[PDB]
């Protein structure tokens, strides 16, 4: 019994800078999707994709612990995510940038409430990594981990505007 | 600066497993290729892929500790991994099989003759995981590790035929 | 003049199994779509793809002699089918498993009320084959034959859901 | 048990118009290629392709029966068929133009020397149609059949040239 | 800083032929589009494709200067353009044919109402020539030229039907 | 008579600065290939691609007037060219950076020994651009234009290396 997952797509990910630190973050539609946290109080941050740092405007902080970057418009990304119409919460892809590396990882996951539980492979940061479906299909954002265990954010497309 | 690599293919692996346990293999050319120590004395090994588990038979043995299986001809996977033209050993993107889960991971490689080291994200069973350059084309199999570093030995299209 | 079609997706085919006998199904969103007649008041199903049986449920059986199979969670079709946006009726592609063997045919066919009609070169068993535009597309779901005459039932958006 | 052939490829069809008759070709390189006895004598032929009519040039006939026409330069096929690296001729996938119809199919195969025969749908003539394996690569061209029963000549690489 | 744009299309365009002269058309869904003053009055039109001319209906004349023709039926593009959702009018793609050949240029854009501003390469014919966004997506129907500047009519989904 | 060209590829294209100017680039291989001249005497270029300079070794300078660069480690472009197999030089497809902008058009072209004549659509500087046949494959490096003429000296595969 393995995991095999589709449409893993790491082309889909970027790093955000910020005086305060560094998280994941990845491209849906217009936007750059990260945690909250990442982005924190900040109106622009610092985008890193293939090499080159954008300057991005902070767009949407809604309740949950998401945060939405307009995708500077010099910035073409190679591939995005998309949200899931069926989700299945059972299994999941994790893709992240973890210091220098890449870290993509499937696991099994638990839903609680609004907030999904799986197994990670670093204990270093992995905010804002997309929480990935078996089609590749974007079901969460990563938020944190205690010990090889990861927590993150259901999202759905209603949390991307008020 | 980070690894932000390409062509990353996970459909071009499968679970190799043998009565002394599991390892990863990978499609290329008509052959599935794997680690030596993962086929040990089976001349008939199984192969799952995409949940469905076949029976295949060892082709050939080469010095290096390397393995190649001819791929079932009812199993027709997704993806197969070319070998590189012009090798860039300085970056790596491994890809395997992990108990139930796949582990994909980049990192900075060193050459020491026809070995490849390179920094792991599990201490766990990685033999016979492809190590391909930063376009996808399979560099090395990956052996052993000491910690989290592994230690790949490096193929060549030579290798293939007696 | 030839019937030159376009985007033929067999991987987006499977067979279907119960106890009175077989049938063709098709992948089309997160169902399998088949005739009624092939599921009859069978609430689970087997599933042939890619050398892999499955054991489905069901979902749903509207009025028209059409049932939709939820695709198992861990079958993961290569291909799936659409619905035609602007349909043209005025030809079609069928592809069907008929025993071993993959078929595919174009046809000149006629619409009438929720009936499509067509030749067809054999007259195998074809119930559930998916009837398509010249796009690739799928039109209706293929009923039965009389005697080379085959007649399918029109699949609509609608037909999804109650 | 089924026959889940791959990468069929319709538009890389054409039909060649002679005074004699008609017949398949098909685009492989820069040519199109069809069984000697669909040319014959003629040093010139008319192709029909995505409803217009070209004339083409008979280039090469070798001592097999298979017959090379340069494909004229302001046709611009969708598709071309490679020949088979490792060919497996156990079965194929059979694809023809029979009348105004597509006709695509499966079947078991055997090898007799440089001859392949293997089982047709129709016994309606499929001269100069490709006869693939199950990974879409041409093995052989239609020349005749007997009943339910086709033959074909295996093709090489070598027979493209004298 | 140079406009390195994406998703270009030449396949998605014909050119369109009547008593009173040429223009460029695309094709989008099931139409092909162009500015009303390369239809006129004309309620049928001529089109070429891949060196095959076409007899076609003009389907639907809307307020703005935009005309939808109905796409042949025999006549099968190998590409289409779709509309964009969040349109960036700021720099664009434009794509024709002039005389007998291909001219693609970039440039910046000024939006104002209903109309579009942009630099063009040639002084030439471009009329009913597709506007596109940086990532190949229809956002206007070029109109005219005063100088080396063009002038277009924004398109909208609406603007397809009454 | 229009020409309808495939397989146009402006993500192979990159923009080479010099103390002395600047040129077209275009990627090949593991290499950019650019005009002679464009590098001069130069060992050192810079290399400018979706908004990142990049610094770039001069890898090849044969008795042609065409340069090879060898493409930087961190520099991972989209698309690269390949040459042709049986070139028709019949008919063209330009791609160039001239100054902000993109620019590719379609030219019938005449032969001079190893150079090659075509109309062009800007008078402006496009030195080193590829020119390519109807299906997008490299047959020229654009050396310089007269007015609107361009002239290219072709290339072959043993140009690459002595
Ligand atoms: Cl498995
Ligand atoms: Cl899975
Ligand atoms: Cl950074
Ligand atoms: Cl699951
Ligand atoms: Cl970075
Ligand atoms: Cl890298
Ligand atoms: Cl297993
Ligand atoms: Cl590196
Ligand atoms: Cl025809
Ligand atoms: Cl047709
Ligand atoms: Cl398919
Ligand atoms: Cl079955
Ligand atoms: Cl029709
Ligand atoms: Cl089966
Ligand atoms: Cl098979
Ligand atoms: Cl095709
Ligand atoms: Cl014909
Ligand atoms: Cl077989
Ligand atoms: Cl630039
Ligand atoms: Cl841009
Ligand atoms: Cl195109
Ligand atoms: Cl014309
Ligand atoms: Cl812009
Ligand atoms: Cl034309
Ligand atoms: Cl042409
Ligand atoms: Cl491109
Ligand atoms: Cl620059
Ligand atoms: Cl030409």
Do not use: W
């Amino acid at each position: 019994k393995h995991h095999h997952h589709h449409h893993i797509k790491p082309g889909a990910l970027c790093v955000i800078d910020t005086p305060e630190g560094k998280g994941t973050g990845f491209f849906s539609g217009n936007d750059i999707v990260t945690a909250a946290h990442v982005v924190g109080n900040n109106t622009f941050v610092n985008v890193c994709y293939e090499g080159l740092m954008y300057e991005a405007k902070v767009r949407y902080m809604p309740e949950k612990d998401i945060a939405f970057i307009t995708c500077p418009g010099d910035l073409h990304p190679t591939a995005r995510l998309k949200l899931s119409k069926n989700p299945d919460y059972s299994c999941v892809t994790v893709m992240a940038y973890v210091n220098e590396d890449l870290v993509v990882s499937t696991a099994a996951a638990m839903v609680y409430g609004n907030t999904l539980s799986y197994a990670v492979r670093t204990q270093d940061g992995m905010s804002g990594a997309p929480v990935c479906d078996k089609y590749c299909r974007v079901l969460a954002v990563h938020q944190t981990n205690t010990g090889y265990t990861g927590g993150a954010v259901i999202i759905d497309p209603t949390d991307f505007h008020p």
